[PDB]
Amino acid sequence: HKVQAVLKQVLKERIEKQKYDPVKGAQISKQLADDLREKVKALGYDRYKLVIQVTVGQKQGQAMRIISRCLWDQTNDNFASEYYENESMYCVCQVYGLYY
Amino acid sequence: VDTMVRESIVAAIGDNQFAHNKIDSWSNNIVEGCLKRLAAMNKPFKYIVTTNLTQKAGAGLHAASCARWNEKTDGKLTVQWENNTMIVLVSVYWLAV
Incomplete structure (x- = not known):
């Protein structure tokens, strides 16, 4: 996604x-x-909202995953996940694109 | 409203121990349990339910959630739980219809 790509761009633009x-x-x-x-x-707001989650972690290499189970209004609520790592920072983002 | 959720969580995963391959599954059951907890109240709203579960491994953390909403009708409620090896967070979000 364009918005997801630019959110990961924002993640790097923060954490580079x-x-x-x-x-x-x-x-x-x-x-x-x-x-x-x-x-x-x-810009990109058109009577929507975003619900956000962020996780930031140190690098150790154990077994870790994400998952999330919800109930939502279906046609208006969407979701996406982002993962990234570098020399010392793992960072994960969870975005919930919902109608306001 | 959330105290019965907290008692449900302490009933379900009280003093239990980590097992990773069913960790998501517990989350699913919790999300279904909280779904019944929402379905018992059935306030005519758009509901959002989310859980988080994480091993107590020794890294310091901070957590909350925010949005930009209609401030009088849209809200958030939460329960945090912990044991010797795990942390549990359950969140419910109200948006009005």
């Missing part, structure tokens, strides 16, 4: 040259979440 940090992380994660919200609430 970076590493996951416990001390920077409260403000870093607030910036992450707010910036993805500002992405989806920019």
Whole structure:
């Protein structure tokens, strides 16, 4: 998806040259979440809303997955997932494109 | 409204232990359980239900959710649970019709 691609662009545009940090992380994660919200609430808003989830993790290499089971109004609610990793930061995003 | 959800969660996965291949499955059953918890209240709204479950492995975390909605009719309710090895989060979102 174009919007998903540009949300992953936003993810990199936040987290490039970076590493996951416990001390920077409260403000870093607030910036992450707010910036993805500002992405989806920019041009591309047409009487919709986005529901957001973000996970940020250190690199250890164990067995981890994601899943999410919901009940939604079907024709108006959509979803997508994004995964990424780098030298030290794993980052996952979950986007819920819903009609406002 | 959410206290019965919390009691349901503490009934279902109280003091239990991690097993990864059915972890999603527990989430599904929880989502179905919470679905019945929504279906018991059946307030004429658009409902969203979500769960999260994660091993207690020693990495510090922070979590919440936000949107940009009609502030008087659209809302959020939540239950956090934990045990020796797991963390559980259940979230319900109201949007009006």
